[PDB]
UniProtKB/Swiss-Prot annotation, chain A:
It comes from Saccharomyces cerevisiae (strain ATCC 204508 / S288c) (Baker's yeast). This is Large ribosomal subunit protein eL21A. Keywords: Cytoplasm, Isopeptide bond, Ribonucleoprotein, Ribosomal protein, Ubl conjugation. GO terms for molecular function: structural constituent of ribosome. There is a cross-link at K31 (Glycyl lysine isopeptide (Lys-Gly) (interchain with G-Cter in ubiquitin)).
UniProtKB/Swiss-Prot annotation, chain D:
It is found in: Cytoplasm. It comes from Saccharomyces cerevisiae (strain ATCC 204508 / S288c). This is Large ribosomal subunit protein eL29. Component of the ribosome, a large ribonucleoprotein complex responsible for the synthesis of proteins in the cell. The small ribosomal subunit (SSU) binds messenger RNAs (mRNAs) and translates the encoded message by selecting cognate aminoacyl-transfer RNA (tRNA) molecules. The large subunit (LSU) contains the ribosomal catalytic site termed the peptidyl transferase center (PTC), which catalyzes the formation of peptide bonds, thereby polymerizing the amino acids delivered by tRNAs into a polypeptide chain. GO terms for cellular component: cytoplasm; cytosol; cytosolic large ribosomal subunit. The gene is RPL29. One of its GO terms (biological process) is cytoplasmic translation.
UniProtKB/Swiss-Prot annotation, chain E:
The lineage of its organism: Eukaryota, Fungi, Dikarya, Ascomycota, Saccharomycotina. GO terms for biological process: cytoplasmic translation. The gene is RPL28. InterPro entries: Ribosomal_uL15, Ribosomal_uL15/eL18, Ribosomal_uL15/eL18_sf, Ribosomal_uL15_CS. There is a cross-link at K95 (Glycyl lysine isopeptide (Lys-Gly) (interchain with G-Cter in ubiquitin)). Residues 1-38 are annotated as: Disordered. Component of the large ribosomal subunit (LSU). Mature yeast ribosomes consist of a small (40S) and a large (60S) subunit. The 40S small subunit contains 1 molecule of ribosomal RNA (18S rRNA) and 33 different proteins (encoded by 57 genes). The large 60S subunit contains 3 rRNA molecules (25S, 5.8S and 5S rRNA) and 46 different proteins (encoded by 81 genes). This is Large ribosomal subunit protein uL15. It comes from Saccharomyces cerevisiae (strain ATCC 204508 / S288c) (Baker's yeast). Signal peptide: none annotated. GO terms for cellular component: cytoplasm; cytosol; cytosolic large ribosomal subunit; nucleus.
Swiss-Prot record, chain F:
Coiled coil: none annotated. PANTHER family: 60S RIBOSOMAL PROTEIN L7, LARGE RIBOSOMAL SUBUNIT PROTEIN UL30. Component of the ribosome, a large ribonucleoprotein complex responsible for the synthesis of proteins in the cell. The small ribosomal subunit (SSU) binds messenger RNAs (mRNAs) and translates the encoded message by selecting cognate aminoacyl-transfer RNA (tRNA) molecules. The large subunit (LSU) contains the ribosomal catalytic site termed the peptidyl transferase center (PTC), which catalyzes the formation of peptide bonds, thereby polymerizing the amino acids delivered by tRNAs into a polypeptide chain. Keywords: Cytoplasm, Ribonucleoprotein, Ribosomal protein. This is Large ribosomal subunit protein uL30A. GO terms for biological process: cytoplasmic translation; maturation of LSU-rRNA; maturation of LSU-rRNA from tricistronic rRNA transcript (SSU-rRNA, 5.8S rRNA, LSU-rRNA); ribosomal large subunit biogenesis. Gene3D superfamilies: Ribosomal protein L30, ferredoxin-like fold domain (3.30.1390.20). It comes from Saccharomyces cerevisiae (strain ATCC 204508 / S288c). Present with 101000 molecules/cell in log phase SD medium.
Amino acid sequence: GKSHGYRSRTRYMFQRDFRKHGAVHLSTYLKVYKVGDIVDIKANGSIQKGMPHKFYQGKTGVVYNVTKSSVGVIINKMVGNRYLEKRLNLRVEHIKHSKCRQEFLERVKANAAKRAEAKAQGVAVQLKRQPAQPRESRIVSTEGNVPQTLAPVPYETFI
Amino acid sequence: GIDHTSKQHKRSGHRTAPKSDNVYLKLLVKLYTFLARRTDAPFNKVVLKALFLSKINRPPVSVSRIARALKQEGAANKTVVVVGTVTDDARIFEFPKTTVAALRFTAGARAKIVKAGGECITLDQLAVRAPKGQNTLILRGPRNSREAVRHFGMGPHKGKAPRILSTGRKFERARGRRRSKGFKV
Amino acid sequence: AISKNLPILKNHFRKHWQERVKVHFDQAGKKVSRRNARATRAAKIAPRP
Amino acid sequence: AKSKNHTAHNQTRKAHRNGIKKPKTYKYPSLKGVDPKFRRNHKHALHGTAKALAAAKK
Amino acid sequence: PSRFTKTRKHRGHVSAGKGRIGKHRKHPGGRGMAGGQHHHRINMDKYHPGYFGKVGMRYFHKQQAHFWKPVLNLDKLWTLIPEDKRDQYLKSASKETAPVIDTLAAGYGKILGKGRIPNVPVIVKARFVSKLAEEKIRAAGGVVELIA
Amino acid sequence: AEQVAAERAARKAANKEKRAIILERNAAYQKEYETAERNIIQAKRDAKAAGSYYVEAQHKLVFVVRIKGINKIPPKPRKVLQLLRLTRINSGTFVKVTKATLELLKLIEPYVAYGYPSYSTIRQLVYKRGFGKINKQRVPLSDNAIIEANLGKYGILSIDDLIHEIITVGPHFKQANNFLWPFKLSNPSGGWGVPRKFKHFIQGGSFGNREEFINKLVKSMN
Amino acid sequence: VLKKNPLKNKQVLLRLNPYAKVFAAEKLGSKKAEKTGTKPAAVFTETLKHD
RNA sequence: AAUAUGUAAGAAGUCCUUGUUACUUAAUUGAACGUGGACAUUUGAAUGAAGAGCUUUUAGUGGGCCAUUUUUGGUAAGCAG
RNA sequence: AAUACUGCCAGCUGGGACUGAGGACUGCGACGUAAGUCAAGGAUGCUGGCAUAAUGGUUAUAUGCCGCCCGUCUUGAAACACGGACCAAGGAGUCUAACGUCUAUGCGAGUGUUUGGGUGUAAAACCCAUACGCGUAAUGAAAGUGAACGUAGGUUGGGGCCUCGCAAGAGGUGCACAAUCGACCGAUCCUGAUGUCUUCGGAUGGAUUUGAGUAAGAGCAUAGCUGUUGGGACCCGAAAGAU
RNA sequence: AAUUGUUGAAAGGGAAGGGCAUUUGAUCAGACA
Ligand SMILES: [Mg+2]
Ligand SMILES: [Mg+2]
Ligand SMILES: [Mg+2]
Ligand SMILES: [Mg+2]
Ligand SMILES: [Mg+2]
Ligand SMILES: [Mg+2]
Ligand SMILES: [Mg+2]
Ligand SMILES: [Mg+2]
Ligand SMILES: [Mg+2]
Ligand SMILES: [Mg+2]
Ligand SMILES: [Mg+2]
Ligand SMILES: [Mg+2]
Ligand SMILES: [Mg+2]
Ligand SMILES: [Mg+2]
Ligand SMILES: [Mg+2]
Ligand SMILES: [Mg+2]
Ligand SMILES: [Mg+2]
Ligand SMILES: [Mg+2]
Ligand SMILES: [Mg+2]
Ligand SMILES: [Mg+2]
Ligand SMILES: [Mg+2]
Ligand SMILES: [Mg+2]
Ligand SMILES: [Mg+2]
Ligand SMILES: [Mg+2]
Ligand SMILES: [Mg+2]
Ligand SMILES: [Mg+2]
Ligand SMILES: [Mg+2]
Ligand SMILES: [Mg+2]
Ligand SMILES: [Mg+2]
Ligand SMILES: [Mg+2]
Ligand SMILES: [Mg+2]
Ligand SMILES: [Mg+2]
Ligand SMILES: [Mg+2]
Ligand SMILES: [Mg+2]
Ligand SMILES: [Mg+2]
Ligand SMILES: [Mg+2]
Ligand SMILES: [Mg+2]
Ligand SMILES: [Mg+2]
Ligand SMILES: [Mg+2]
Ligand SMILES: [Mg+2]
Ligand SMILES: [Mg+2]
Ligand SMILES: [Mg+2]
Ligand SMILES: [Mg+2]
Ligand SMILES: [Mg+2]
Ligand SMILES: [Mg+2]
Ligand SMILES: [Mg+2]
Ligand SMILES: [Mg+2]
Ligand SMILES: [Mg+2]
Ligand SMILES: [Mg+2]
Ligand SMILES: [Mg+2]
Ligand SMILES: [Mg+2]
Ligand SMILES: [Mg+2]
Ligand SMILES: [Mg+2]
Ligand SMILES: [Mg+2]
Ligand SMILES: [Mg+2]
Ligand SMILES: [Mg+2]
Ligand SMILES: [Mg+2]
Ligand SMILES: [Mg+2]
Ligand SMILES: [Mg+2]
Ligand SMILES: [Mg+2]
Ligand SMILES: [Mg+2]
Ligand SMILES: [Mg+2]
Ligand SMILES: [Mg+2]
Ligand SMILES: [Mg+2]
Ligand SMILES: [Mg+2]
Ligand SMILES: [Mg+2]
Ligand SMILES: [Mg+2]
Ligand SMILES: [Mg+2]
Ligand SMILES: [Mg+2]
Ligand SMILES: [Mg+2]
Ligand SMILES: [Mg+2]
Ligand SMILES: [Mg+2]
Ligand SMILES: [Mg+2]
Ligand SMILES: [Mg+2]
Ligand SMILES: [Mg+2]
Ligand SMILES: [Mg+2]
Ligand SMILES: [Mg+2]
Ligand SMILES: [Mg+2]
Ligand SMILES: [Mg+2]
Ligand SMILES: [Mg+2]
Ligand SMILES: [Mg+2]
Ligand SMILES: [Mg+2]
Ligand SMILES: [Mg+2]
Ligand SMILES: [Mg+2]
Ligand SMILES: [Mg+2]
Ligand SMILES: [Mg+2]
Ligand SMILES: [Mg+2]
Ligand SMILES: [Mg+2]
Ligand SMILES: [Mg+2]
Ligand SMILES: [Mg+2]
Ligand SMILES: [Mg+2]
Ligand SMILES: [Mg+2]
Ligand SMILES: [Mg+2]
Ligand SMILES: [Mg+2]
Ligand SMILES: [Mg+2]
Ligand SMILES: [Mg+2]
Ligand SMILES: [Mg+2]
Ligand SMILES: [Mg+2]
Ligand SMILES: [Mg+2]
Ligand SMILES: [Mg+2]
Ligand SMILES: [Mg+2]
Ligand SMILES: [Mg+2]
Ligand SMILES: [Mg+2]
Ligand SMILES: [Mg+2]
Ligand SMILES: [Mg+2]
Ligand SMILES: [Mg+2]
Ligand SMILES: [Mg+2]
Ligand SMILES: [Mg+2]
Ligand SMILES: [Mg+2]
Ligand SMILES: [Mg+2]
Ligand SMILES: [Mg+2]
């Protein structure tokens, strides 16, 4: 019949990275997780215990619980026409801290400074992010830079 | 041809006049649309709506839920307003003075209010006393104290009262309700 | 014939019940008849009560 | 009499009618599945700092 | 009445609102509670968990009445006194003269203690009290007098 | 009771001051406009003079009209058409050019024709078929007091104060441009020029960015 | 009760935009711009006519 | 790789001060929850928004078929998936 | 120098078509030294014809273009798929018992006169004692026990109201509702005080356990659309089986 | 009512009936004042 076991189809998903097999390096267990941390899930094939289901691979969530060797991560899986709440019990080897918030944090502290230094200067701030605007006008120089004229080339084979 | 972004010809889904046919109800509704159109006071807009609410959404306000409201800091001289009937509660032993304006007062609670030295105002006397609702404290009854809402959202692990006629053991209490008869919920 | 979230009912109508329906159409009848029955017993019974 | 076996045709049509609702978010989430030994002590923690704050309006 | 019935509105359309594919045949699922373990089990577990199978003990020839024992809380209690008489005793709370309430005369079997009665002494005759009911009475200076 | 001419006077005098501010305002844009244009003309000249090449700024405003009808549209372009408020055929809106919307225009090129509006065609769009969203209620612009009531918050108290905010992509181009109901154009009055419409402008159809050729299109559809 | 297009209704053209009278009165629509005579560098002319 | 796909873009925020406990540390260490204080809409991209959220009950349906693109079986099919 | 080409003008101007909604005034303006005038929030002026089958409605016919049999089941029917020659008159979701949601009404910690009695202008209307039913307590298989640490709790959002301010806004209080952490009652598991007819008694404090519970009641009754189950059960239909 | 006879009117080159439109014939309302 058909097959649909718990790790079905994960041939390459749980493979190990090229020339990167073996013990997990000792920082993986030196990282520290707190309730509220945003973490990325990537299962480690070498650590069978406390492993996410293939669905939660590549998926980011928030820790809600911190145990001896593990973290509880709630994740919103969308079943049907709605999202449900899913809490996962992962071990520290399959989780990792998401830099998806660093850009935000790096922008918060920066935003405070831009604001304090401008206020203590004389207002005029503007610290929302804006998209890429079109280019401005410019004058390009011909000096040392005469236009090299091109034409399409004929047909050849060289085989 | 327009690519519509929203359902077309959709009713707002809020009542517009009470569904009741009571003449006197329509008169109070008459009074209060006027007040609500020409006063800029919010209290009139709220009151105007409550007059449309169906009997479910007019749970009785007990006389003791009122006495509680007057125990709020700085709320004890406010004149409470109930857009519904007010029921007596034999469980409070001391009731304060104050003025309660309602659609109905039960025989029991009108006593308990008047006895302790208060006053029972119909919602139009209230309009005259307080066109902007000055010094009013509107109380609503408890809506989900209704019995029927026990059965709403029934389902596995929802803890939610089966629509049952006779009860007791022998009445939906075995397989699927205990670890030893198949499973539990 | 099981559907929706409805209370399980027990409407015992699987015998030939329509044969044994008693409508008390004579309710007013038999009260009139009971009142007259006592008004006769009263009179038969002399001053006894 | 064979007939069709399966399709996801038209299912995303339907799911999008009344939405794909966002997951809903609450300040103060539930402690459901949190370590018991933490919660036990934390029950006593709030109790304590509750008591200290009534002692701040005594 | 029949003039408001939706079938008046269905007149003229072929199917009476019952569908052209799906028809309105006799009994598709079978009659009654048929197949509550089979084609209808999804609806029996949920909406009706606990329906199949046995629990507890049988009890041949149980006479309810044996177990007649209505309950009343301190919650009420003072309500068993007529309201005019009531205020007389609420004030002048003492021993020497304290109301007798025959809660069986009011047709109650047990007194529970839902909560808080004024500090008036009351003499409570009843068949059964709850530990709290009985303790809360005393804190007001009343007693409970076991009757039958 | 006075008012009669008393508060008639208080108003009619202040209605004369508003037109005063508008006249001195509209006079200024005009100077700005032509001097802006003459400056560029001289930029290009002075560059060839200096043996070099003047490249203009990329346009920052664009005007998009829906070319394609309503049905058989894939879900993604179909959202973007809704977000761009072009939900019916031949209507059109202005769009500010940024990375985050240049990528929107890309996603709907098979269904829209757009390009670079000239002051003349922005002017004649607002004047003739310019309406305002005011409690929805698509209101015709017909009087300058309509605008100031709803856009006076942000400057902008004349119909040309609008056009100025649009054409220059001002600080409040979002609120000014959204204040305008989508423009409802008719079919081009001389026809489309191409035999078949739903090819790119470059391939001899009508859709995509035809740059300043949008003006001849739009002017016939107005 | 009836939108009058400006553009062809002078009355309404002047209800909006009071500058319309200035603008008409000073031609402006046909403003003769300044006559200058800058000629292009030969680098420009060469590369233009080049191949 | 392309196309698809997880998360983030703030008031439920950020920073100072220092309380509660039975958890935890060699330790008033930490963890969790707090009292008190400092900073407002350029308060943290875009575009849109005939508003947003929520609750109850109930019909019909549960034979589907076609097109472009991807694609399995078959020499193929107006074939089967 | 000119011209083309492309673009602009709040430059002028002719021919043609369709429309004329609104019904005192009110608005934004324009022209005028001015008085006034205007094409400025929707047609008026002048002239003629007939006052009639002239126009218009109906109808029959002709002409241009167009138009397959309805009903049904079906992915697909005009089908070489079925029913239907024609017309009249019958002709199919009903009533009941018990229910879910919703709504209107009565009264409300209650509610329900109509088994019955009283009475009557007599199947009506009017009146009513004792019970009973449902509700006001839950939880255990059961024996049983049985709902305030506290302003009936803390936190966060809440309409409304109160206070300051001209206002914008700030504080105060905050029902309903939602989220969260606690407290109470029963089941389960621990703990086992003071005592004792030495095995009875079970205070007290607890636990990732558990209940259709408590935490200032919301119910009862009549009615109605829809929906549910049993009934001949929307109407018509077996092959059979039994006495 | 189906259906039939008579009389009157009208149309008909392998069906009939229908839609929008107008000519022609027949017929009729209203409005003028
Ligand atoms: Mg397989
Ligand atoms: Mg695999
Ligand atoms: Mg193992
Ligand atoms: Mg309502
Ligand atoms: Mg409520
Ligand atoms: Mg209850
Ligand atoms: Mg219910
Ligand atoms: Mg039960
Ligand atoms: Mg269901
Ligand atoms: Mg029976
Ligand atoms: Mg049977
Ligand atoms: Mg029988
Ligand atoms: Mg009989
Ligand atoms: Mg009789
Ligand atoms: Mg089969
Ligand atoms: Mg097949
Ligand atoms: Mg199927
Ligand atoms: Mg009827
Ligand atoms: Mg009808
Ligand atoms: Mg219908
Ligand atoms: Mg019909
Ligand atoms: Mg139906
Ligand atoms: Mg159907
Ligand atoms: Mg049918
Ligand atoms: Mg079908
Ligand atoms: Mg099932
Ligand atoms: Mg059973
Ligand atoms: Mg047994
Ligand atoms: Mg037994
Ligand atoms: Mg007790
Ligand atoms: Mg836009
Ligand atoms: Mg591009
Ligand atoms: Mg031409
Ligand atoms: Mg033409
Ligand atoms: Mg063409
Ligand atoms: Mg062609
Ligand atoms: Mg045009
Ligand atoms: Mg590639
Ligand atoms: Mg994406
Ligand atoms: Mg301490
Ligand atoms: Mg603070
Ligand atoms: Mg945004
Ligand atoms: Mg964008
Ligand atoms: Mg917007
Ligand atoms: Mg809106
Ligand atoms: Mg349904
Ligand atoms: Mg099936
Ligand atoms: Mg179904
Ligand atoms: Mg079927
Ligand atoms: Mg392919
Ligand atoms: Mg096929
Ligand atoms: Mg030209
Ligand atoms: Mg021109
Ligand atoms: Mg007119
Ligand atoms: Mg008119
Ligand atoms: Mg003048
Ligand atoms: Mg005029
Ligand atoms: Mg005539
Ligand atoms: Mg004549
Ligand atoms: Mg005629
Ligand atoms: Mg006539
Ligand atoms: Mg004539
Ligand atoms: Mg005529
Ligand atoms: Mg004829
Ligand atoms: Mg004909
Ligand atoms: Mg044809
Ligand atoms: Mg037919
Ligand atoms: Mg077939
Ligand atoms: Mg079908
Ligand atoms: Mg076919
Ligand atoms: Mg057919
Ligand atoms: Mg055929
Ligand atoms: Mg057949
Ligand atoms: Mg036949
Ligand atoms: Mg029938
Ligand atoms: Mg019925
Ligand atoms: Mg009621
Ligand atoms: Mg009671
Ligand atoms: Mg009677
Ligand atoms: Mg009488
Ligand atoms: Mg009689
Ligand atoms: Mg009487
Ligand atoms: Mg009696
Ligand atoms: Mg009773
Ligand atoms: Mg009972
Ligand atoms: Mg109950
Ligand atoms: Mg109680
Ligand atoms: Mg209990
Ligand atoms: Mg019991
Ligand atoms: Mg015991
Ligand atoms: Mg305690
Ligand atoms: Mg205690
Ligand atoms: Mg807290
Ligand atoms: Mg506030
Ligand atoms: Mg507060
Ligand atoms: Mg407990
Ligand atoms: Mg248990
Ligand atoms: Mg047990
Ligand atoms: Mg129960
Ligand atoms: Mg209750
Ligand atoms: Mg109720
Ligand atoms: Mg309903
Ligand atoms: Mg049925
Ligand atoms: Mg038969
Ligand atoms: Mg037979
Ligand atoms: Mg037979
Ligand atoms: Mg047999
Ligand atoms: Mg025989
Ligand atoms: Mg022939
Ligand atoms: Mg005709
Ligand atoms: Mg006349």
